Scaffold this motif. Structure first.
Motif, PDB file in Angstrom:
ATOM      1  N   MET A  49       0.781  -1.220   0.000  1.00 47.58           N
ATOM      2  CA  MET A  49       0.000   0.000   0.000  1.00 47.58           C
ATOM      3  C   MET A  49       0.817   1.277   0.000  1.00 47.58           C
ATOM      4  O   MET A  49       0.277   2.388   0.109  1.00 47.58           O
ATOM      5  CB  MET A  49      -1.052   0.039   1.146  1.00 47.58           C
ATOM      6  N   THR A  54       1.378   1.323  -5.313  1.00 47.56           N
ATOM      7  CA  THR A  54       0.000   1.603  -5.684  1.00 47.56           C
ATOM      8  C   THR A  54      -0.169   2.602  -6.796  1.00 47.56           C
ATOM      9  O   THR A  54      -1.180   2.523  -7.519  1.00 47.56           O
ATOM     10  CB  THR A  54      -0.831   2.079  -4.455  1.00 47.56           C
ATOM     11  N   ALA A  66      -2.275  -5.037  -2.842  1.00 52.63           N
ATOM     12  CA  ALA A  66      -3.068  -4.506  -1.725  1.00 52.63           C
ATOM     13  C   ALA A  66      -4.386  -5.224  -1.636  1.00 52.63           C
ATOM     14  O   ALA A  66      -4.864  -5.560  -0.543  1.00 52.63           O
ATOM     15  CB  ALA A  66      -3.232  -3.004  -1.905  1.00 52.63           C
TER      16      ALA A  66
END
Length: 303
Positions: A49, A54, A66
């Motif tokens: 994350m 991301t 994630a």
């Protein structure tokens, strides 16, 4: 898997969780998944994350790792701490090269809102801002501070609150392990001031990356962190060079002593997988067996 769960035992003392850092790479190899299932009640993504993972290119998000973690956690009854929205490390160069305030503000807000909306309602707590302080207590001169200014922290937290009002919003840092210490005093002072200004900071996270013998100091530092008046504090990334039971039991007792301490996350499962593996600083060894410090925590928590 250890027979006795430190998470069940800490829950029986009124805490929310005892958890660990993990991710798909760990869960799908060795004995990590079974250990986490058996002995822990919460997970933090070690890497999946972060901003590099991301949003590796602007607006082209990659949620596969994630998503795996969130879904696994839900399947297995584990709470999740999202980690981490605004941080200078593991930050793509497309972000850190921006020199325009509006540009970076909009990038930051979109990153926060996109991640938090995706997982809305599933995430107990987010580390919204990570490692904002220098060791002297001044604010770290990251791209966010340099280009957005002081407002970046208020903006981040307000944006986060709007995106998922259910999540507990944390500022997280390390070297908050002494009550004496410019960073410790500074985060308390600045959190008090931010909250008095209406910034929605629900938690102070103390990473608690310790050296041998240092755990005793947390008994004084954690109540000082709690004096900032956030609804929660937490030990977020605990590991201890040498993994002495004395250090680990001291940190556990500090959390027990501080009612607003909701729980503890240890920063990985087995020693060779630690970010500081050579110091064998975790609660399971390289053969996936519980170490003396695991057993010492279990016994400390027994009633």
């Amino acid at each position: 898997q250890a027979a006795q769960s430190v998470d069940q035992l800490i829950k029986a003392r009124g805490k929310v969780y005892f958890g660990v850092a993990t991710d798909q790479n760990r869960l799908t190899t060795g004995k990590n998944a079974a250990i986490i299932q058996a002995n822990f009640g919460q997970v933090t993504p070690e890497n999946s994350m972060k901003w590099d993972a991301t949003e590796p290119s602007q607006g082209n998000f990659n949620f596969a790792g994630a998503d795996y973690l969130v879904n696994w956690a839900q399947q297995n009854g584990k709470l999740i701490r999202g980690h981490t929205l605004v941080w200078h490390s593991q930050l793509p160069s497309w972000v850190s090269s921006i020199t325009d305030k509006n540009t970076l503000t909009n990038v930051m807000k979109n990153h926060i809102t996109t991640l938090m909306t995706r997982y809305k309602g599933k995430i107990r707590a987010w580390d919204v801002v990570n490692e904002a302080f220098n060791e002297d207590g001044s604010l770290r001169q990251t791209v966010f501070l340099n280009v957005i200014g002081e407002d970046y922290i208020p903006i981040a937290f307000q944006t986060a609150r709007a995106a998922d009002p259910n999540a507990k919003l944390y500022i997280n840092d390390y070297n908050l392990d002494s009550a004496s210490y410019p960073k410790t005093q500074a985060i308390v002072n600045r959190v008090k001031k931010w909250r008095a200004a209406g910034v929605p900071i629900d938690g102070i996270g103390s990473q608690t990356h310790l050296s041998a013998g240092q755990g005793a100091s947390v008994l004084q530092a954690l109540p000082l962190l709690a004096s900032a008046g956030t609804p929660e504090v937490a030990i977020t990334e605990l590991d201890v060079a040498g993994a002495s039971s004395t250090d680990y039991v001291n940190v556990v007792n500090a959390c027990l002593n501080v009612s607003s301490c909701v729980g503890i996350t240890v920063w990985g499962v087995a020693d060779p997988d630690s970010w500081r593996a050579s110091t064998t600083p975790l609660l399971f060894d390289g053969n996936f067996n519980p170490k003396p410090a695991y057993n010492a925590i279990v016994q400390n928590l027994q009633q």
